[PDB]
Enzyme design. Structure first.
Site, PDB file in Angstrom:
ATOM      1  N   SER A   1     -13.155  -8.002   4.343  1.00  0.00           N
ATOM      2  CA  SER A   1     -14.893  -8.339   4.017  1.00  0.00           C
ATOM      3  C   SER A   1     -15.492  -7.985   2.923  1.00  0.00           C
ATOM      4  O   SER A   1     -15.759  -6.839   2.604  1.00  0.00           O
ATOM      5  CB  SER A   1     -15.598  -7.692   5.207  1.00  0.00           C
ATOM      6  OG  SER A   1     -16.922  -7.624   5.201  1.00  0.00           O
TER       7      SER A   1
ATOM      8  N   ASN B   1     -18.556  -8.722   1.820  1.00  0.00           N
ATOM      9  CA  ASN B   1     -20.043  -7.985   1.948  1.00  0.00           C
ATOM     10  C   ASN B   1     -20.151  -6.639   2.563  1.00  0.00           C
ATOM     11  O   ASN B   1     -21.169  -6.005   2.422  1.00  0.00           O
ATOM     12  CB  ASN B   1     -20.814  -8.948   2.841  1.00  0.00           C
ATOM     13  CG  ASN B   1     -21.053 -10.251   1.975  1.00  0.00           C
ATOM     14  OD1 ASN B   1     -21.697 -10.396   0.895  1.00  0.00           O
ATOM     15  ND2 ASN B   1     -20.362 -11.573   2.513  1.00  0.00           N
ATOM     16  N   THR B   2     -19.018  -6.227   3.197  1.00  0.00           N
ATOM     17  CA  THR B   2     -18.801  -4.746   3.715  1.00  0.00           C
ATOM     18  C   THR B   2     -17.366  -4.314   3.578  1.00  0.00           C
ATOM     19  O   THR B   2     -17.263  -3.060   4.063  1.00  0.00           O
ATOM     20  CB  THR B   2     -19.211  -4.725   5.227  1.00  0.00           C
ATOM     21  OG1 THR B   2     -18.205  -5.520   6.124  1.00  0.00           O
ATOM     22  CG2 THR B   2     -20.604  -5.338   5.459  1.00  0.00           C
TER      23      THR B   2
ATOM     24  N   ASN C   1      -4.901 -12.091  10.460  1.00  0.00           N
ATOM     25  CA  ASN C   1      -4.224 -10.596  10.518  1.00  0.00           C
ATOM     26  C   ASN C   1      -4.720 -10.360  11.871  1.00  0.00           C
ATOM     27  O   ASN C   1      -5.278 -10.913  12.698  1.00  0.00           O
ATOM     28  CB  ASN C   1      -4.904  -9.991   9.312  1.00  0.00           C
ATOM     29  CG  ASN C   1      -3.774  -8.929   8.683  1.00  0.00           C
ATOM     30  OD1 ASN C   1      -3.207  -8.197   9.650  1.00  0.00           O
ATOM     31  ND2 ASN C   1      -3.792  -8.636   7.535  1.00  0.00           N
TER      32      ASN C   1
ATOM     33  N   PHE D   1       1.003  -0.069   5.029  1.00  0.00           N
ATOM     34  CA  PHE D   1       1.856  -0.879   3.652  1.00  0.00           C
ATOM     35  C   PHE D   1       2.816   0.380   3.436  1.00  0.00           C
ATOM     36  O   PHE D   1       3.050   0.258   2.164  1.00  0.00           O
ATOM     37  CB  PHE D   1       0.627  -1.136   2.562  1.00  0.00           C
ATOM     38  CG  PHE D   1      -0.072  -2.115   3.312  1.00  0.00           C
ATOM     39  CD1 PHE D   1      -1.530  -1.702   3.850  1.00  0.00           C
ATOM     40  CD2 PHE D   1      -0.087  -3.562   3.026  1.00  0.00           C
ATOM     41  CE1 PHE D   1      -2.614  -2.670   4.372  1.00  0.00           C
ATOM     42  CE2 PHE D   1      -1.261  -4.359   3.342  1.00  0.00           C
ATOM     43  CZ  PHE D   1      -2.270  -3.784   4.221  1.00  0.00           C
TER      44      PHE D   1
ATOM     45  N   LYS E   1      -5.123 -14.627   2.851  1.00  0.00           N
ATOM     46  CA  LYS E   1      -5.114 -13.947   4.444  1.00  0.00           C
ATOM     47  C   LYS E   1      -6.224 -13.320   4.783  1.00  0.00           C
ATOM     48  O   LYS E   1      -6.379 -12.262   4.179  1.00  0.00           O
ATOM     49  CB  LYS E   1      -3.689 -13.457   4.614  1.00  0.00           C
ATOM     50  CG  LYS E   1      -3.394 -13.065   6.165  1.00  0.00           C
ATOM     51  CD  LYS E   1      -2.191 -12.585   6.286  1.00  0.00           C
ATOM     52  CE  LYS E   1      -1.973 -12.334   7.889  1.00  0.00           C
ATOM     53  NZ  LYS E   1      -0.386 -11.875   8.014  1.00  0.00           N
TER      54      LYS E   1
ATOM     55  N   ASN F   1      -0.898  -1.184  15.457  1.00  0.00           N
ATOM     56  CA  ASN F   1      -0.160  -0.730  14.246  1.00  0.00           C
ATOM     57  C   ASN F   1      -1.220  -0.254  13.112  1.00  0.00           C
ATOM     58  O   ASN F   1      -2.241  -0.808  13.077  1.00  0.00           O
ATOM     59  CB  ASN F   1       0.933  -1.585  13.939  1.00  0.00           C
ATOM     60  CG  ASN F   1       0.289  -2.389  12.527  1.00  0.00           C
ATOM     61  OD1 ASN F   1       0.329  -1.999  11.455  1.00  0.00           O
ATOM     62  ND2 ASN F   1      -0.056  -3.857  13.125  1.00  0.00           N
TER      63      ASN F   1
HETATM   64  C1  LIG Z   1       3.801  -4.141  13.191  1.00  0.00           C
HETATM   65  C2  LIG Z   1       3.127  -4.876  12.366  1.00  0.00           C
HETATM   66  C3  LIG Z   1       3.223  -4.856  11.072  1.00  0.00           C
HETATM   67  C4  LIG Z   1       2.335  -5.947  10.334  1.00  0.00           C
HETATM   68  N1  LIG Z   1       2.335  -5.730   8.945  1.00  0.00           N
HETATM   69  C5  LIG Z   1       1.873  -6.666   8.115  1.00  0.00           C
HETATM   70  C6  LIG Z   1       1.862  -6.980   6.579  1.00  0.00           C
HETATM   71  O1  LIG Z   1       2.395  -5.930   6.260  1.00  0.00           O
HETATM   72  N2  LIG Z   1       1.131  -7.709   6.125  1.00  0.00           N
HETATM   73  C7  LIG Z   1       0.440  -8.792   6.851  1.00  0.00           C
HETATM   74  O2  LIG Z   1      -0.295  -9.652   6.023  1.00  0.00           O
HETATM   75  N3  LIG Z   1       0.366  -8.828   8.107  1.00  0.00           N
HETATM   76  C8  LIG Z   1       1.050  -7.920   8.844  1.00  0.00           C
HETATM   77  N4  LIG Z   1       0.941  -7.893  10.323  1.00  0.00           N
HETATM   78  C9  LIG Z   1       0.127  -9.027  10.829  1.00  0.00           C
HETATM   79  C10 LIG Z   1       0.880 -10.117  11.185  1.00  0.00           C
HETATM   80  O3  LIG Z   1       1.499 -10.733  10.050  1.00  0.00           O
HETATM   81  C11 LIG Z   1      -0.013 -11.131  12.096  1.00  0.00           C
HETATM   82  O4  LIG Z   1      -0.968 -11.768  11.374  1.00  0.00           O
HETATM   83  C12 LIG Z   1      -0.634 -10.549  13.197  1.00  0.00           C
HETATM   84  O5  LIG Z   1       0.101  -9.583  13.995  1.00  0.00           O
HETATM   85  C13 LIG Z   1      -0.951 -11.770  14.241  1.00  0.00           C
HETATM   86  O6  LIG Z   1       0.124 -12.274  14.900  1.00  0.00           O
HETATM   87  P1  LIG Z   1       0.990 -11.869  16.258  1.00  0.00           P
HETATM   88  O7  LIG Z   1      -0.172 -11.771  17.351  1.00  0.00           O
HETATM   89  O8  LIG Z   1       1.791 -12.996  16.477  1.00  0.00           O
HETATM   90  O9  LIG Z   1       1.617 -10.505  16.001  1.00  0.00           O
HETATM   91  C14 LIG Z   1       1.622  -6.856  10.852  1.00  0.00           C
HETATM   92  C15 LIG Z   1       1.642  -6.901  12.481  1.00  0.00           C
HETATM   93  C16 LIG Z   1       2.081  -6.337  13.192  1.00  0.00           C
HETATM   94  C17 LIG Z   1       2.298  -6.037  14.534  1.00  0.00           C
HETATM   95  O1  LIG Z   2       1.156  -1.984   7.095  1.00  0.00           O
HETATM   96  C1  LIG Z   2       0.210  -2.163   7.999  1.00  0.00           C
HETATM   97  O2  LIG Z   2      -0.578  -1.316   8.453  1.00  0.00           O
HETATM   98  C2  LIG Z   2      -0.496  -3.559   8.183  1.00  0.00           C
HETATM   99  C3  LIG Z   2      -0.609  -4.461   7.178  1.00  0.00           C
HETATM  100  C4  LIG Z   2      -1.406  -5.742   7.412  1.00  0.00           C
HETATM  101  O3  LIG Z   2      -1.800  -6.559   6.784  1.00  0.00           O
HETATM  102  N1  LIG Z   2      -1.732  -6.013   8.797  1.00  0.00           N
HETATM  103  C5  LIG Z   2      -1.546  -5.087   9.785  1.00  0.00           C
HETATM  104  O4  LIG Z   2      -1.524  -5.225  11.077  1.00  0.00           O
HETATM  105  N2  LIG Z   2      -0.719  -3.961   9.590  1.00  0.00           N
END
Ligand SMILES: Cc1cc2nc3c(=O)[nH]c(=O)nc-3n(C[C@H](O)[C@H](O)[C@H](O)COP(=O)(O)O)c2cc1C
Ligand SMILES: O=C(O)c1cc(=O)[nH]c(=O)[nH]1
Ligand SMILES: CCn1c(CO)nn(-c2nc(O[C@@H](C)C(F)(F)F)c(C(=O)Nc3c(F)cccc3Cl)cc2F)c1=O
EC number: 1.3.5.2
Length: 355
Positions: free
Chosen positions: A181, A183-184, A243, A115, A214, A111
């Site tokens: 990150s 440092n980068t 994440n 945001f 996170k 994805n």
């Molecule tokens: C479509 C999609 C949207 C996401 N949006 C966010 C987000 O807005 N903020 C966030 O911290 N993580 C976001 N994530 C990350 C998930 O919270 C999670 O950390 C990550 O997908 C790993 O878990 P999974 O393998 O069970 O999906 C998103 C993941 C997906 C697949």
């Molecule tokens: O909104 C997103 O693109 C998004 C945010 C995030 O923290 N993690 C992610 O995989 N997608």
């Protein structure tokens, strides 16, 4: 395995995903869940952490319910806790479409939503409307987390996160800040988290949330050492690990593997688990970890718990298995705890480190 688990996994989910584009599938899922259109936890699954009771350790990860539209339905689905967001200060549309890609051969998603958010004010009013119901849910072992983000055009990330603490902190059991990150680098992270914690400490004690950081798995060894150090120095309450990944592990088969964005699901699983292991060791087991990435079974959940997670989350598994995955993970986790001689989830937390 139940009748529903097999039916959803083998027939219903493949059919629905074959008829819908991925973003339509997401929107419909949020709508169905919000209306409660959906199919008892043993005491072995209870965890006490982050100043709360969690009746089970399996949460919905951020991203599914970005705008806080489906919280009650998510509890009805069987999640022990719900995380909404990410929520940005002002509303924003996110990236242009297409921005969500299925990799069924890898049991993965990519994805680049960017945001997309209804903004703090809309989410504030949505949470306020059910705040007493949430207070009862939290008391009964079903807490709420809110994941805060920043607007695309913001000059100072600390100001965006401070706004989120002020507005949604009083409605949350915990808040989450995403960290990239440094440092980068380290001084900038310290500055950021200092402001977040000062803002949090300004809230009345009865409405004062835990603060978690996170992290992505795409961090150097130096980044991880620096994060652990700052987290302990400042008294950050916990970590969410991890994440999505911007890496593309060798072996991905999906036709869409070269699309830009974050990769989730099965290819992330062991990268996430190894990051939990490292962060638990760097914080001496004294900082609660929520483990996330590629969980679709009791075994997957238990591996993260043993590596140092107190709680786990999932999202991507829902896209392939549907709602019955929640009960599957919980039932398999209970069975494996019994098989390995643990009295409950609590006794397994970090158990690989005490071998
Ligand atoms: C479509 C999609 C949207 C996401 N949006 C966010 C987000 O807005 N903020 C966030 O911290 N993580 C976001 N994530 C990350 C998930 O919270 C999670 O950390 C990550 O997908 C790993 O878990 P999974 O393998 O069970 O999906 C998103 C993941 C997906 C697949
Ligand atoms: O909104 C997103 O693109 C998004 C945010 C995030 O923290 N993690 C992610 O995989 N997608
Ligand atoms: C990553 C974006 N993304 C994708 C694409 O990659 N899929 N997806 C999900 N899609 C779902 O169902 C789709 C197919 C629906 F059209 F049926 F809604 C569900 C789900 O639980 N549906 C559902 C329910 F909510 C209540 C009762 C029965 C059912 Cl089957 C959960 C998801 F995460 C999702 O968020």
């Amino acid at each position: 395995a139940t009748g529903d688990e097999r039916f959803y996994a083998e027939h219903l989910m493949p059919t629905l995903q074959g008829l819908l584009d991925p973003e339509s599938a997401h929107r419909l899922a949020v709508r169905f869940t919000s209306l409660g259109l959906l199919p008892q936890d043993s005491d072995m699954l209870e965890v006490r952490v982050l100043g709360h009771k969690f009746r089970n350790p399996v949460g919905i990860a951020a991203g599914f319910d970005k705008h806080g539209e489906a919280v009650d339905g998510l509890y009805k689905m069987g999640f022990g806790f719900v995380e909404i967001g990410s929520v940005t200060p002002k509303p924003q549309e996110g990236n242009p479409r297409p921005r969500v890609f299925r990799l069924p051969e890898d049991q993965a998603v990519i994805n680049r939503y960017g945001f997309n958010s209804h903004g703090l004010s809309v989410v504030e009013h949505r949470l306020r409307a059910r705040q007493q119901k949430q207070a009862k849910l939290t008391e009964d072992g079903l807490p709420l987390g809110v994941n805060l983000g920043k607007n695309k055009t913001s000059v100072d990330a600390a100001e965006d996160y401070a706004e989120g603490v002020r507005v949604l902190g009083p409605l949350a059991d915990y808040l989450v800040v995403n960290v990239s990150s440094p440092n980068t680098g380290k001084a900038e992270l310290r500055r950021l988290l200092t402001k977040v914690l000062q803002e949090r400490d300004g809230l009345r004690r009865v409405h004062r949330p835990a603060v978690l950081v996170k992290i992505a798995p795409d961090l150097t060894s130096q980044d991880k050492e620096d994060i652990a150090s700052v987290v302990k120095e400042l008294g950050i309450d916990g970590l969410i690990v991890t994440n999505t990944t911007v890496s593309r592990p060798a072996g991905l088969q999906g036709a869409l593997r070269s699309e830009t964005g974050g990769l989730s699901g099965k290819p992330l699983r062991d990268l996430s688990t190894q990051t939990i292991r490292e962060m638990y060791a760097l914080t001496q087991g004294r900082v609660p970890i929520i483990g996330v990435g590629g969980v679709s079974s009791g075994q997957d959940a238990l591996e993260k718990i043993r590596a140092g997670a107190s709680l786990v989350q999932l999202y991507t598994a829902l896209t392939f298995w549907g709602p019955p995955v929640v009960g599957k993970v919980k039932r398999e986790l209970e069975a494996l705890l019994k098989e390995q001689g643990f009295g409950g989830v609590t006794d397994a937390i970090g158990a690989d480190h005490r071998r």
